[PDB]
Design a protein around this nucleic acid. Structure first.
Lengths: 415, 50, 50, 200, 48
DNA sequence: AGGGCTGATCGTGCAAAAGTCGTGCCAGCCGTCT
DNA sequence: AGACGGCTGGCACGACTTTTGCAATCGCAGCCCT
């Protein structure tokens, strides 16, 4: 306004201490390791008994079958080598030639290795070590009874018509195999129930860990959030060390204690401020993401980093630092902090939509479709434009790739 | 021996090794920094009792 | 994963996405179910037949 | 490896008669161990993988559940004893994890609680010192004298903090004394056995 | 009937083959005992 | 006897170049109907 | 049986993101060089 100079009264270059403090808040579990590392340097800052029960582990069964089955010593070694080349799904990871090379025996021939592999295939109750989907299907068909509807047709299709089934080219398969129309569907359905990856049944393991860091939930009609008390690290100044340093007879020892106390106080203040800033940022993010929190992913507001930065006094750089490897648990579930931010899509009615919400709606529409006639990407684009997509189906194509949606030709199948 | 699945929470064998390891690390790091005799002696006594 | 992609194009709807963690009766127990109950936390409304 | 004797080599045991017992030596402890732990971390919840240089860590205690190396490369039975470069891990069975003990350096000296605490004081009967003196000097609050014959002081006598400071004040840097386990270690290493045996 | 890992499989093989023959091995619990004693500053080993 | 000058102490950002996506747009191709 | 079509994938471009690389000016005074 009016030109003038300073007529009444009213910034900082953060050094390595505050600089590393800013470099902090990148993670939480990793932050604990660095905090322990600093606390090591800083001296003024502070039967029925459950034991593991062995399991088959999808390989001890194979070893037990090998031991029980009668095999030669060389045959036993080859069987052990084959068991080494195993997968959780149940297919042989390494090639037969690879097994022969690893054997390192002039005698070791491909015929003996093949005989051992064939014996092992029928050895375990679950058909395994097929190393080929066609081989596994053939093993399943052989195990299946001879008196089956279109069993020979299904075997012929599995033999060399795997590609036709892969592309769902039913017309091409019917033309090539000269199979019966609308009757080969029975053979296809029978082939569908062939237990692919049979070994995976013996494999079972789950994480059962989320390690939550924040807790936000609806209460009294409003979303309330709080940092996880257990997860947040805490530091305490060593009172005994502070007392010793204050009354230290040696001047040098007292000065060193004072320097250590200053460093520890700076670190503690930085940690507390980082935690508080993260809490405030999470509260601000929730204030605007309550719609997605309550209604679901479809009601996700298109939000950017600057949008969150505007509601707070911190910069977008602080927003990025806060939105770094942070996971928050809520009634909906566990989600990353960065998952909140989404692209803005122009839409009918003037509003902008979150690209994540658009992809979720697209997936919901695609799943709820007639299996006989799969929706075209152009058709899906028109359907979303009926809701105001303002998209050219290239972004829809990218979203479908993100969701691994198959082609309209591929999605279609026999009814 | 995981109890909750999320946290294994070893006890009676590993908390002791954890204490000894961290205390020895702090003493070894501190001994190289020409610490005052009182603090290093107290840390050594902590290590011995651990 | 070309093998897994081929399997999914053939069978699909499993894609080895889920492992069987179904609740099965331990051996040596035979009986008749009297009744089941389900408790769902607030915020989730799946309620398929709850 | 012919792969026909390697499997036969694992399942073997000795005659194993005449079991003995003796005190252990630091060199034997070093020979027993393969690596040294340095971090209190045991397992990571970010990847559920063995830590680095700590409890349950790789490059010590042996491999992980399979012949697969922790880095991810060299994962097959074709490799029998090779050690990868990005990760130092012997490609073997998992059972060996129950047969590899670790070691920690522990730069500061430390006494062994099984000794000097049972009914007979091994340190006490070795040094002819009362137990009270040995536990008082074991905790940095007794300041026993180590040596010094020029001064009018006994070889093995208790000199409290005030006593130690004044003794160093008048006698100068001659009455050497220590307050930790290294004091006991020095007093015990710097003594003959046959001469005292003959005297007794 | 015990911790002997190399004995259980061998005896199962002999029984299913109808051999009824015994191979002793050495218990794993004694190995645990040795490892636990060696954890203390006490050397213990097996002679010949 | 007078000048040089020496090291203590200090400090929640940002911006600038780089990257990187959202969206659209073009080229080809194969299933197909002609 | 050569062309329609929808897919898919490569290509490009402004518009959101973000990360690292900086580490200012300040009053004491006694000691060393001239």
């Amino acid at each position: 306004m009016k030109q003038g100079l300073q007529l009444r009264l009213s910034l900082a270059m953060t050094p390595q201490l505050q600089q590393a403090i800013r470099l902090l808040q990148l993670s939480t579990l990793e932050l604990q390791q660095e905090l322990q590392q600093a606390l090591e340097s800083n001296p003024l800052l502070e039967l029925p008994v459950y034991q593991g029960e062995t399991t088959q582990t999808l390989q001890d069964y194979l070893m037990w079958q090998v031991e029980l089955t009668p095999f030669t010593d060389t045959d036993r070694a080859i069987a052990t080598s084959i068991v080494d080349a195993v997968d959780d799904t149940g297919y042989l990871t390494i090639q037969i030639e690879d097994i022969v090379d690893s054997i390192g025996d002039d005698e070791i021939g491909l015929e003996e290795v093949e005989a051992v592999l064939k014996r092992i295939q029928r050895f375990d109750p679950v058909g395994v070590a097929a190393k080929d989907l066609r081989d596994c299907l053939l093993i399943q068909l052989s195990q299946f009874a001879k008196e089956t509807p279109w069993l020979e047709e299904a075997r012929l299709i599995i033999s060399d018509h795997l590609d036709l089934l892969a592309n769902h080219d039913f017309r091409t398969l019917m033309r090539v195999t000269r199979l019966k129309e609308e009757v080969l569907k029975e053979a296809v359905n029978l082939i569908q129930s062939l237990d692919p990856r049979p070994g995976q049944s013996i494999q079972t393991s789950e994480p059962e860990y989320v390690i939550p860091d924040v807790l936000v939930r609806k209460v009294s009609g409003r979303w309330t959030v709080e940092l996880n008390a257990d997860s947040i690290p805490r530091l305490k100044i060593n009172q005994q060390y502070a007392a010793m340093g204050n009354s230290a007879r040696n001047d040098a020892d007292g000065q060193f204690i004072r320097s250590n106390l200053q460093e520890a106080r700076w670190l503690i203040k930085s940690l507390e401020s980082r935690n508080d800033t993260l809490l405030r940022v999470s509260r601000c993010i929730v204030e605007q993401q309550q719609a997605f929190f309550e209604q679901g992913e479809e009601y996700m507001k298109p939000m950017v980093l600057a949008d969150i930065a505007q509601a707070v006094e911190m910069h977008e750089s602080t927003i990025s630092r806060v939105t770094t490897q942070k996971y928050l648990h809520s009634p909906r579930g566990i989600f990353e902090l960065k998952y909140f931010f989404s692209s803005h899509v122009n839409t009918e009615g003037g509003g902008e939509a979150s690209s994540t919400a658009i992809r979720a709606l697209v997936k919901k529409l695609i799943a709820a479709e007639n299996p006989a006639k799969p929706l075209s990407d152009s058709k899906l684009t028109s359907m979303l434009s009926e809701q105001g997509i303002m998209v050219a189906r290239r972004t829809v194509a990218k979203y479908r790739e993100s969701l691994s949606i198959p082609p309209s030709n591929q999605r279609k199948q026999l009814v | 021996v995981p109890l909750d699945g999320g946290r294994f929470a070893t006890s009676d064998l590993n908390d002791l090794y954890r204490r000894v390891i961290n205390r020895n690390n702090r003493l070894k790091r501190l001994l190289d920094l020409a610490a005052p005799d009182i603090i290093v002696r107290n840390e050594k006594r902590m290590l011995q009792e651990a | 994963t070309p093998e897994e992609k081929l399997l999914r194009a053939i069978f699909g709807e499993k894609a080895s996405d889920v492992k069987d963690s179904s609740l099965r009766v331990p051996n040596g127990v035979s009986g008749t179910v009297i009744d089941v109950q389900v408790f769902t936390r607030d915020g989730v409304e799946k309620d398929k037949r709850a | 490896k012919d792969l026909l004797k390697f499997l036969k080599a694992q399942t073997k045991t000795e005659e194993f008669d005449a079991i003995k017992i003796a005190l252990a030596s630091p060199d034997m402890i070093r020979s027993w161990s393969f690596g040294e732990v340095k971090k209190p971390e045991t397992i990571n919840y970010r990847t559920f993988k063995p830590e680095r240089d700590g409890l349950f860590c790789a490059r010590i205690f042996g491999p992980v559940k399979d012949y697969e190396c922790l880095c991810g490369k060299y994962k097959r039975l074709k490799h029998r004893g090779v050690i990868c470069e990005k990760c130092g891990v012997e490609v073997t069975q998992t059972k060996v994890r129950r047969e590899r003990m670790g070691h920690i350096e522990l730069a500061s000296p430390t006494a062994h609680i099984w000794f000097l605490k049972s009914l007979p004081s091994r340190i006490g009967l070795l040094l002819d010192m009362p137990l009270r003196d040995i536990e008082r000097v074991l905790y940095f609050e007794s300041y026993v004298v180590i040596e010094g014959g020029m001064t009018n002081l006994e070889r093995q006598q208790i000199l409290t903090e005030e006593q130690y400071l004044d003794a160093l004040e008048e006698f100068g840097d001659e009455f050497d004394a220590k307050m930790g386990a290294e004091a006991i270690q020095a007093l015990l290493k710097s003594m003959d056995l046959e001469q005292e045996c003959e005297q007794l | 009937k015990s911790d002997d890992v190399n004995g259980r499989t061998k005896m199962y093989k002999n029984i299913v083959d109808g051999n009824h023959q015994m191979e002793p091995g050495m218990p794993e619990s004694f190995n645990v005992l040795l490892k636990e004693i060696r954890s203390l500053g006490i050397n213990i080993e097996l002679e010949d």
